[PDB]
Design a protein around this ligand. Sequence first.
Ligand SMILES: O=c1[nH]c2ccccc2n1-c1ccc(O)cc1O
Length: 207
Amino acid sequence: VETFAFQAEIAQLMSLIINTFYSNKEIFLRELISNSSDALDKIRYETLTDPSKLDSGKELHINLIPNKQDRTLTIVDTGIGMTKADLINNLGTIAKSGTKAFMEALQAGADISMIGQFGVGFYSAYLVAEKVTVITKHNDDEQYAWESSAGGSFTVRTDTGEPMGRGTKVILHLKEDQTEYLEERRIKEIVKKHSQFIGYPITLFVE
Ligand SMILES: O=c1[nH]c2ccccc2n1-c1ccc(O)cc1O
């Protein structure tokens, strides 16, 4: 198990998110589904020039799996996935995002609301989760599990668990007061309101 520090600005962004009373928390699901769609688009385009890219799995979809017993909501996609390097760089640093302008924008006009337009939508997961685990398999690497309960650091380790072929699974370990996101009716309404036009099947697994 390797432990890494988040880039300073990401750590600051996470604390803000972690501690906010921002009301419209449901946007977290929109952001994760939008990230999954992007990942699926990526593997799908690459497969136009090289069909063998789908040897790890031909299905392109997104599944939502609430688990009331474990208090987890899991978002699984079969997109392009992430290499170890991608995990460390993309979830650990500002990378390609507009993080700095977002951090500045506490004086522009928008609050916590425009996160997704600044390329940092992923972190909205911390509005509802005390901890996030990301399990991922990219065609070019082994399967890895990234995890963080914020606080400034994250871990990365080889994942020997159930093989996924290719894709990314985000497991949200929900805060005790955010269990509404495990309710079928709530999940349905959020998908309909924010993600209805996503170009891949989004399937809710009923408990
Ligand atoms: O695993 C991934 N590879 C990607 C490539 C491009 C965009 C998003 C990508 N993702 C990705 C990132 C965050 C998620 O919540 C889900 C994902 O599938």
